[PDB]
Write a protein that holds these residues in place. Structure first.
Motif, PDB file in Angstrom:
ATOM      1  N   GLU A 249       0.654  -1.303   0.172  1.00  0.00           N
ATOM      2  CA  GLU A 249      -0.005  -0.013   0.104  1.00  0.00           C
ATOM      3  C   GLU A 249       0.796   1.187  -0.057  1.00  0.00           C
ATOM      4  OE1 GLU A 249      -2.537  -2.244  -0.912  1.00  0.00           O
ATOM      5  OE2 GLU A 249      -3.681  -0.379  -0.134  1.00  0.00           O
ATOM      6  N   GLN A 250       2.242   1.112   0.298  1.00  0.00           N
ATOM      7  CA  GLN A 250       3.088   2.620   0.688  1.00  0.00           C
ATOM      8  C   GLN A 250       2.779   3.657  -0.142  1.00  0.00           C
ATOM      9  OE1 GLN A 250       5.791   1.899   3.639  1.00  0.00           O
ATOM     10  NE2 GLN A 250       3.693   0.681   3.496  1.00  0.00           N
ATOM     11  N   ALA A 251       2.207   3.577  -1.372  1.00  0.00           N
ATOM     12  CA  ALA A 251       1.965   4.698  -2.276  1.00  0.00           C
ATOM     13  C   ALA A 251       1.011   5.614  -1.646  1.00  0.00           C
ATOM     14  CB  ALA A 251       1.497   4.387  -3.697  1.00  0.00           C
ATOM     15  N   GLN A 252       0.064   5.252  -1.162  1.00  0.00           N
ATOM     16  CA  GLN A 252      -1.092   6.000  -0.501  1.00  0.00           C
ATOM     17  C   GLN A 252      -0.929   5.827   0.979  1.00  0.00           C
ATOM     18  OE1 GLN A 252      -4.938   3.982   0.947  1.00  0.00           O
ATOM     19  NE2 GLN A 252      -4.986   3.326  -1.379  1.00  0.00           N
ATOM     20  N   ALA A 253      -0.333   4.706   1.375  1.00  0.00           N
ATOM     21  CA  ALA A 253      -0.263   4.281   3.103  1.00  0.00           C
ATOM     22  C   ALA A 253       1.134   5.168   3.612  1.00  0.00           C
ATOM     23  CB  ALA A 253      -0.162   2.803   3.300  1.00  0.00           C
ATOM     24  N   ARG A 254       1.957   5.746   3.063  1.00  0.00           N
ATOM     25  CA  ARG A 254       2.885   6.626   3.483  1.00  0.00           C
ATOM     26  C   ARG A 254       2.132   7.565   4.608  1.00  0.00           C
ATOM     27  NH1 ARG A 254       5.071  10.157   6.015  1.00  0.00           N
ATOM     28  NH2 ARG A 254       5.254   8.176   7.028  1.00  0.00           N
ATOM     29  N   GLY A 255       1.573   8.491   4.204  1.00  0.00           N
ATOM     30  CA  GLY A 255       0.985   9.165   5.374  1.00  0.00           C
ATOM     31  C   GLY A 255       0.450  10.583   4.818  1.00  0.00           C
ATOM     32  N   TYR A 256      -0.871  10.435   4.055  1.00  0.00           N
ATOM     33  CA  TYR A 256      -1.566  11.612   3.461  1.00  0.00           C
ATOM     34  C   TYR A 256      -2.325  12.077   4.583  1.00  0.00           C
ATOM     35  CZ  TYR A 256      -5.333   8.348   2.012  1.00  0.00           C
ATOM     36  OH  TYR A 256      -6.043   7.242   2.085  1.00  0.00           O
ATOM     37  N   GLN A 257      -1.994  12.159   6.210  1.00  0.00           N
ATOM     38  CA  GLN A 257      -2.789  12.334   7.033  1.00  0.00           C
ATOM     39  C   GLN A 257      -1.891  12.537   8.481  1.00  0.00           C
ATOM     40  OE1 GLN A 257      -5.797  13.606   7.359  1.00  0.00           O
ATOM     41  NE2 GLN A 257      -5.714  13.755   9.427  1.00  0.00           N
ATOM     42  N   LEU A 258      -2.384  13.484   9.466  1.00  0.00           N
ATOM     43  CA  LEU A 258      -1.793  13.516  10.558  1.00  0.00           C
ATOM     44  C   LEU A 258      -0.760  14.791  10.484  1.00  0.00           C
ATOM     45  CD1 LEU A 258      -1.544  13.207  13.757  1.00  0.00           C
ATOM     46  CD2 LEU A 258       0.241  11.459  13.327  1.00  0.00           C
ATOM     47  N   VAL A 259       0.099  14.815   9.499  1.00  0.00           N
ATOM     48  CA  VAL A 259       1.059  15.766   9.063  1.00  0.00           C
ATOM     49  C   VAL A 259       0.364  16.346   7.817  1.00  0.00           C
ATOM     50  CG1 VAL A 259       2.514  13.994   7.573  1.00  0.00           C
ATOM     51  CG2 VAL A 259       3.496  16.116   8.441  1.00  0.00           C
ATOM     52  N   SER A 260      -0.754  16.164   7.750  1.00  0.00           N
ATOM     53  CA  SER A 260      -1.719  16.860   6.370  1.00  0.00           C
ATOM     54  C   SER A 260      -1.210  15.806   5.171  1.00  0.00           C
ATOM     55  CB  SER A 260      -1.482  18.402   6.085  1.00  0.00           C
ATOM     56  OG  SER A 260      -2.120  18.551   5.016  1.00  0.00           O
ATOM     57  N   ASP A 261      -0.193  15.843   4.673  1.00  0.00           N
ATOM     58  CA  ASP A 261       0.450  15.063   3.622  1.00  0.00           C
ATOM     59  C   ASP A 261       1.738  15.641   3.123  1.00  0.00           C
ATOM     60  OD1 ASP A 261      -0.285  16.414   0.109  1.00  0.00           O
ATOM     61  OD2 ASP A 261      -0.873  17.558   2.108  1.00  0.00           O
ATOM     62  N   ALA A 262       2.315  15.222   2.020  1.00  0.00           N
ATOM     63  CA  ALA A 262       3.741  15.848   1.468  1.00  0.00           C
ATOM     64  C   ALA A 262       3.699  17.028   1.229  1.00  0.00           C
ATOM     65  CB  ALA A 262       4.030  14.986   0.122  1.00  0.00           C
ATOM     66  N   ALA A 263       2.600  17.955   1.173  1.00  0.00           N
ATOM     67  CA  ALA A 263       2.486  19.213   0.857  1.00  0.00           C
ATOM     68  C   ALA A 263       2.413  20.135   2.192  1.00  0.00           C
ATOM     69  CB  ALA A 263       0.943  19.602   0.036  1.00  0.00           C
ATOM     70  N   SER A 264       2.691  19.569   3.242  1.00  0.00           N
ATOM     71  CA  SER A 264       2.570  20.201   4.563  1.00  0.00           C
ATOM     72  C   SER A 264       4.100  21.101   4.435  1.00  0.00           C
ATOM     73  CB  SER A 264       2.836  19.133   5.848  1.00  0.00           C
ATOM     74  OG  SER A 264       3.953  18.140   5.627  1.00  0.00           O
ATOM     75  N   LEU A 265       3.450  22.248   4.191  1.00  0.00           N
ATOM     76  CA  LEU A 265       4.551  23.694   4.181  1.00  0.00           C
ATOM     77  C   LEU A 265       4.342  24.404   5.570  1.00  0.00           C
ATOM     78  CD1 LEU A 265       6.643  24.672   2.161  1.00  0.00           C
ATOM     79  CD2 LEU A 265       4.775  26.363   1.176  1.00  0.00           C
ATOM     80  N   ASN A 266       3.970  23.965   6.352  1.00  0.00           N
ATOM     81  CA  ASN A 266       3.741  24.490   7.668  1.00  0.00           C
ATOM     82  C   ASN A 266       2.826  25.988   7.661  1.00  0.00           C
ATOM     83  OD1 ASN A 266       3.941  25.173  10.588  1.00  0.00           O
ATOM     84  ND2 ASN A 266       6.037  26.452  10.165  1.00  0.00           N
ATOM     85  N   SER A 267       1.536  25.824   7.564  1.00  0.00           N
ATOM     86  CA  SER A 267       0.322  26.673   7.287  1.00  0.00           C
ATOM     87  C   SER A 267       0.578  27.248   6.013  1.00  0.00           C
ATOM     88  CB  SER A 267       0.426  28.019   8.481  1.00  0.00           C
ATOM     89  OG  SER A 267      -0.580  28.744   8.188  1.00  0.00           O
ATOM     90  N   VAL A 268      -0.042  26.585   4.925  1.00  0.00           N
ATOM     91  CA  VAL A 268      -0.145  26.631   3.665  1.00  0.00           C
ATOM     92  C   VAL A 268      -0.596  28.084   3.143  1.00  0.00           C
ATOM     93  CG1 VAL A 268      -0.272  25.729   1.330  1.00  0.00           C
ATOM     94  CG2 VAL A 268       0.344  24.198   3.335  1.00  0.00           C
ATOM     95  N   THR A 269      -2.327  27.793   3.201  1.00  0.00           N
ATOM     96  CA  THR A 269      -2.945  29.078   2.768  1.00  0.00           C
ATOM     97  C   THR A 269      -4.550  29.046   3.290  1.00  0.00           C
ATOM     98  OG1 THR A 269      -3.865  30.035   0.665  1.00  0.00           O
ATOM     99  CG2 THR A 269      -3.747  27.996   0.479  1.00  0.00           C
ATOM    100  N   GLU A 270      -4.540  28.775   4.586  1.00  0.00           N
ATOM    101  CA  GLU A 270      -5.883  28.140   5.377  1.00  0.00           C
ATOM    102  C   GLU A 270      -5.946  28.911   6.755  1.00  0.00           C
ATOM    103  OE1 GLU A 270      -3.625  25.782   7.829  1.00  0.00           O
ATOM    104  OE2 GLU A 270      -2.875  27.260   6.477  1.00  0.00           O
ATOM    105  N   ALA A 271      -4.779  29.213   7.594  1.00  0.00           N
ATOM    106  CA  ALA A 271      -4.859  29.502   8.986  1.00  0.00           C
ATOM    107  C   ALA A 271      -5.067  30.957   8.947  1.00  0.00           C
ATOM    108  CB  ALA A 271      -3.586  28.993   9.575  1.00  0.00           C
ATOM    109  N   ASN A 272      -4.256  31.998   8.590  1.00  0.00           N
ATOM    110  CA  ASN A 272      -4.222  33.263   8.714  1.00  0.00           C
ATOM    111  C   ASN A 272      -4.218  33.969   7.427  1.00  0.00           C
ATOM    112  OD1 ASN A 272      -1.285  33.490   8.201  1.00  0.00           O
ATOM    113  ND2 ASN A 272      -0.891  33.804  10.342  1.00  0.00           N
TER     114      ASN A 272
END
Lengths: 471, 155, 155, 155, 155
Positions: A249-272
């Protein structure tokens, strides 16, 4: 009426557009076929007739069931539990094992091994769509703008709803959970108390309407008809599973959750990032509290006695039988039909010797046997004293027939080799007869006002404009 | 429904939803004086509609009449419908599919929708138990069909 | 019932209910620009205590960690608890009846609870696919050597 | 609790609920194959009744409909009944307070119910706009206000 | 009169929904053998943030508690969110929309979730009492009325 308020019974009939949900007969009820509708009178209607010979029992006794979806990892437990139900009680709480200690009552070892890695299951398979209908206009009309459907995207995938794709559902392992000794052939005994079923659950034969006191009707006598896993359930059997996860499963089962996903840029365009101005809710002088007297635990609470009461008769027993109609449908054409993929050759051979029913040489039977059969129910209370043992065969069920049945010559007037579609049947005709369209009830009527009169044909003085909620 | 790409059955769940609701509470305000689980009268019905080839939309209508004593409390009814491709199936596994597999996933939705109309009418909590449809209809189509020798003539 | 019992396991579902629920949509109005089925991780944990005589409550944490695109859609979880009566069973299999079968009863209704909150958040309808956590917790039972002999005074 | 507002004479809601609900979707599985051109009908209805001592009711029957000729998309009708403990005041005050103001305050709760029960049919949401009969009531009464003990914080 | 454009304060409702939902009931089975008298404590939390061009978000959390000291019965918490396209620099006028109107619009949707969650925990239903959010800003006075800027300050 209908014993146990918390019920469901069954359903009047199965789904007609699928196909005709009944096998044809020739000797109705009697395999010997005594056949004697008095002479000039016919006696009682007994339109059901063959229905009393149709299996008999197996209400609470489950010989089979299933419920899976596109994914479903599983492995049947070694316990082999006979479940059942009996809620409320309204007397002694319970008896047996005073101490009930789990190995880990609280999850210190944890059932979930932390979402950051593939625990066991990861992949999901489903499809659906959200909605909008963006209203507009405030003054006069509180919604008049045709606004919902923006230009549709390529999102419509079609294959989003994949056509099952099991494969396992045939040549591996079917249900067959009461595969043992059965005092009937199919259902009764094997494991658990079976469909014990304290008398025919008739309530008051059909409906009853209005009976004396609630002592008869449920509220007093609420010994539930097994229910809640009545026979066995969770018996050692594989569901087939098929769609297994593993580490692959590793393709999806890596972790697109908890850390958001691979696009986790530390507050992208949602918070402030979305907010420039606005600074309300700094304080509010309007409190809530309870502006008047309240009582949460006043009442409106009771113990709902949960039961599986089928009731042999629901509202009215219709002629549930579909034979052939066309007749020459038995003769069929080039179709073969005899090969029904894979099926068991009845129960295991040599099991039942036909000692339990046996029968009797009723060549010419008189009314003596017909009347005494009403009285003989007392004899039947004693059960089959001779306990049919699990006598096994050399050939395991499916391989019990050596030769297959060739179609054409085996006419088989109820298989895939059919014609005339369903011979009309029934469409959405009687939908109006289901309390449809008619003014059957509207509470009772207007109770009228008191503090005011409010009796004016115009409700308010605003003919409010619509177009506020489309399909 | 032919033979080509059929093999045995054609099954898939396409969509789950409600087609019809009814709720009439004649003694909606009058419940305040009566605190217990009311008399419940269960009635069901079989409604369907054909959408496409092998695609049939089958509906489980669940009628519930409730009464506190010898007076009606409320009336409720749901039609749990669903779009399905369900055809081609035969024999024993027919009643085992549309009598076990399909009802067990649609039941929590009809149940909750009833319980929701009750809870919106702000009445005592009323939720129905999971019944086993499978064997009940499976028994009704059992008549000596296990040994299909037929024996008419030839053709 | 209760009295007049024989030598065989007895099991009675007394009560099915939510002790705890959650639905958390942090990126909610941002992620509504995305109209498709959220990518869901099926995540299960349990917790329990004895608060009943010959009866034990087991709570199934059915958890849905859903994401649309390069962001989290929503975080849903339901602690569907149930009061289940058990007797006439011994050893590890004794308490594994409530440690597998009993929350497996609760799972179709845990699905229903989640589905409704997904649609309350205006997200595409999520029907959870059935899965046996039975296999996982079965391993966790034989993967414990604490053994308090008695203890259990607290929970 | 012990800070019952009651400004001597006061209108106080003790209960809000759906007395009657109705949903009809004959073309629920046909909504997709049909044209996206429904005629959305709205209908206004108001009635009141006595229940008990100083315990009164006003019901708001909102009727939402969408139809395409003879083939109806959906129906969404909700008799949002409310128990209003209205006393101390009289005349045109109470006449428009329960006759016009009470159904207008029930309109958010009727909006809510309609929104939920249509979404149970997996049809789109409809979040109707607000209208201020509170301002209208005070305005028509004298505008200047006074005498009638309005529900008022420190401001 | 020629409207032409005139973006004189934008009012449009995008949608309403539950952002966050919660229920807690530690002593959920333990309730049966306690004193049936919980201290029902209410709470309201407030949040607001702009999302997009002329699109703002208003969130009103409602939290209801039921506890008779240390002996806690249950808890429920719903952060109800509502998206409203508002702008034009409305000042005291928008202070109504998000700080008075919207709390009342989101009030029934939050309340249904709470009344559902107690019924999901299989507990006696509890409806929250109405709050006059706008009546405060209504009775009072906005010094400049509202003033929506106007680009030309002429026509």
């Amino acid at each position: 009426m209908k014993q146990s308020t918390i019920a469901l019974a069954l359903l009047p009939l199965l789904f007609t557009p699928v196909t005709k949900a009944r096998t044809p007969e020739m000797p109705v009820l009697e395999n010997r076929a005594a056949q004697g509708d008095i002479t000039a009178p016919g006696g009682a209607r007994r339109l059901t007739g063959d229905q009393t010979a149709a299996l008999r029992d197996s209400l609470s006794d489950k010989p089979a069931k299933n419920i899976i979806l596109l994914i479903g990892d599983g492995m049947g437990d070694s316990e082999i539990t006979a479940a059942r139900n009996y809620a409320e009680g309204a007397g002694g709480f319970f008896k047996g094992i005073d101490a009930l200690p789990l190995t880990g009552q609280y999850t210190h070892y944890a059932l979930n091994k932390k979402t950051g890695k593939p625990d066991y299951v990861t992949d999901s398979a489903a499809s659906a769509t959200a909605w909008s209908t963006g209203v507009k206009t405030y003054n006069g009309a509180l919604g008049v703008d045709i606004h919902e459907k923006d230009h549709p995207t390529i999102l419509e995938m079609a294959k989003a709803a994949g056509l099952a794709t099991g494969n396992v559902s045939t040549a591996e392992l079917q249900d067959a959970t009461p595969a043992a000794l059965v005092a009937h052939v199919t259902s009764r005994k094997c494991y658990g108390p079976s469909a014990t079923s304290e008398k025919c659950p008739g309530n008051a034969l059909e409906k009853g309407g209005k009976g004396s006191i609630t002592e008869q009707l449920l509220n007093a006598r609420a010994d539930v008809t097994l229910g809640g896993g009545a026979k066995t359930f969770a018996e050692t059997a594989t569901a087939g599973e098929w769609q297994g996860k593993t580490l692959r499963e590793q393709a999806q089962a890596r972790g697109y959750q908890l850390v958001s996903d691979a696009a986790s840029l530390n507050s992208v365009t949602e918070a402030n990032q979305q907010k420039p101005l606005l600074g309300l809710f700094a304080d509010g002088n309007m409190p809530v509290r309870w502006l008047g007297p309240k009582a949460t635990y006043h009442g409106n609470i009771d113990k709902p006695a949960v039961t599986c009461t089928p009731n042999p008769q629901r509202n009215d027993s219709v002629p549930t039988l579909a034979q052939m109609t066309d007749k020459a449908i038995e003769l069929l054409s080039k179709n073969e039909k005899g090969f029904f993929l894979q099926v068991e050759g009845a129960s295991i051979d040599k099991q039942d010797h036909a000692a339990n029913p046996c029968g009797q040489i009723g060549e010419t039977v008189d009314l003596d046997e017909a009347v005494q059969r009403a009285l003989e129910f007392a004899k039947k209370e004693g059960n089959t004293l001779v306990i049919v043992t699990a006598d096994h065969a050399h050939a395991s069920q499916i391989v019990a027939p050596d030769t297959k049945a060739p179609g054409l010559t085996q006419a088989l007037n109820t298989k895939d080799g059919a014609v005339m579609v369903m011979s009309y049947g029934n469409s959405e005709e009687d939908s109006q007869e289901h309390t449809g369209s008619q003014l059957r009830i509207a509470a009772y009527g207007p109770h009228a006002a008191n503090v005011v009169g409010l009796t004016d044909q115009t409700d308010l003085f605003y003919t409010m404009k619509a177009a506020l909620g489309l399909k | 429904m032919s033979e080509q790409n059929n093999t045995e059955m054609t099954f898939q769940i396409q969509r789950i939803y409600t087609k019809d609701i009814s709720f009439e509470a004649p003694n909606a305000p009058h419940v305040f004086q009566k605190d217990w689980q009311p008399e419940v009268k269960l009635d069901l019905d079989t409604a369907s509609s054909q959408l496409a080839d092998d695609v049939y939309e089958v509906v489980l209508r669940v009628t519930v009449t409730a009464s506190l004593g010898e007076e009606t409390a409320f009336l409720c009814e749901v039609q749990q419908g669903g779009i399905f491709s369900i055809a081609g199936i035969e024999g024993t596994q027919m009643a085992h599919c549309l009598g076990a597999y399909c009802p067990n996933i649609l039941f929590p939705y009809a149940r909750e929708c009833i319980t929701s109309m009750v809870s919106r009418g702000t009445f005592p909590q009323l939720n129905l138990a999971p019944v086993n449809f499978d064997a009940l209809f499976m028994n009704y189509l059992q008549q000596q069909a296990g040994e299909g020798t037929e024996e008419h003539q030839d053709a």
